[PDB]
Amino acid sequence: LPKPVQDLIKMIFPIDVNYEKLKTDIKVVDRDSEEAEIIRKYVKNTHATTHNAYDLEVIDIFKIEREGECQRYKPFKQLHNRRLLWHGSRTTNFAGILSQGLRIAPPEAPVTGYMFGKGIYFADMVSKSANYCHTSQGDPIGLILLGEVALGNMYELKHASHISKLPKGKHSVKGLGKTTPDPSANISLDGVDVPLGTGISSGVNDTSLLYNEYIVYDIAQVNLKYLLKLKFNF
Ligand SMILES: Cc1cc(N)c(NC(=O)c2cccc(-c3nc4c(C(N)=O)cccc4[nH]3)c2)cc1C
Ligand SMILES: OC[C@H]1O[C@@](CO)(O[C@H]2O[C@H](CO)[C@@H](O)[C@H](O)[C@H]2O)[C@@H](O)[C@@H]1O
Structure with missing residues (x-):
């Protein structure tokens, strides 16, 4: 396995045995390629201003295909309003995330x-x-996912709801933030919208959220595309 993939396997845990454990094809993305430049733009332009504790710096970009995930996503790949969005988590979770995908809390949970x-x-x-990688100066390396999310018809909300049932057709x-990546900068990679514009005011002022949130309630609406290794500089 390429050295970057070996260092990734070591981060989240011999090597090839654990790699097969992940049930995921992992490939390194060329630094000089356009995938990489699009992703680095996304990172550079969408760094909020209230999160000035750290600067982000991309170390490695991996293209990942989880086993079965594309066959499961099928019914939503034609769905309009597909969007390429971030998801962070603690390094410890990633072994599971790749082997089992992003999941939903159990039906009987608070x-x-x-x-x-x-x-x-x-x-x-x-x-x-x-912010959800929960890295620190003692451990300033974390992992963020980029997922293709089949958003479809969005229920746009300004305030928390705390329920998991959508109206019909949604x-x-x-969650509408006061700040959104400039939509005039959105680009379409492989049919999927990448909102890599610099943050500008959304025009919403009646809202609880500084920045957008996107929630889906079916695990088949997610197709994990990339996994970035990030250095946090505090
Ligand atoms: C060890 C461990 C334990 C638990 N319980 C969780 N989960 C939460 O604390 C939790 C619960 C509810 C919502 C959200 C949440 N995530 C995001 C994200 C994201 N992720 O980029 C992006 C935008 C809005 C978000 N709202 C997170 C995560 C980890 C690593
Ligand atoms: O579509 C998957 C997922 O969507 C939910 C709500 O998240 O329901 C939506 O999609 C259904 C299938 O098209 C529609 O019938 C429904 O009207 C719509 O809200 C879930 O039911 C489902 O797991």
Whole structure:
């Protein structure tokens, strides 16, 4: 395996045995390629200003295909409003995330900590998701996912709801932030919208959220595309 992939396997845990454990094809993305430049732009432009504790710096970019995930995502790949969005988590979770995919809290679990109910959460501001890696100066390396999310018809909300059931015809929730990546800069990679614009005012002022959130309540609406290794500089 390429050295970057070996260092990734060591981060989240011999090597080839654990790699097969992940049930995931992992490939290194060329630094000089356009995938990489699009991703680095996304990172650079969507760093919120209230998250000035750290600067982000991309170390490695991996293209990942989880086993079965594309065959499971099928019914939503034609779904309009597909979007490439961040998801952060503690390094410890990633072994599981890759082997089993992003999951939903169990049906009988408290909803009080879930601003928009028990679903799978995403941001379009890199720092908003990077906050959920919970890295520090003692461990300034973390992992963020980029997922293709089949948002469909969004239920746009300004305030928490704490339930997991959508109205009919809705497929996702968008928590509306006061700040959103400039839509005039969105680009379409492989049919999927990448909101890599610099943050500008959304025009919403009646809202609880500084930045957007995107929630889906079916694990088949997610197709993990990339995994970034980030250095946090505090
Ligand atoms: C060890 C461990 C334990 C637990 N319980 C969790 N989960 C939560 O604390 C939790 C619960 C509810 C919502 C969200 C949440 N995530 C995001 C993200 C993201 N992720 O980029 C992006 C935008 C909005 C978000 N809202 C997170 C995570 C980890 C690593
Ligand atoms: O579509 C998958 C997922 O969407 C949910 C809500 O998240 O329901 C939506 O999609 C259904 C299938 O098209 C629609 O019938 C429904 O009207 C719509 O809200 C879930 O039911 C489902 O797991």
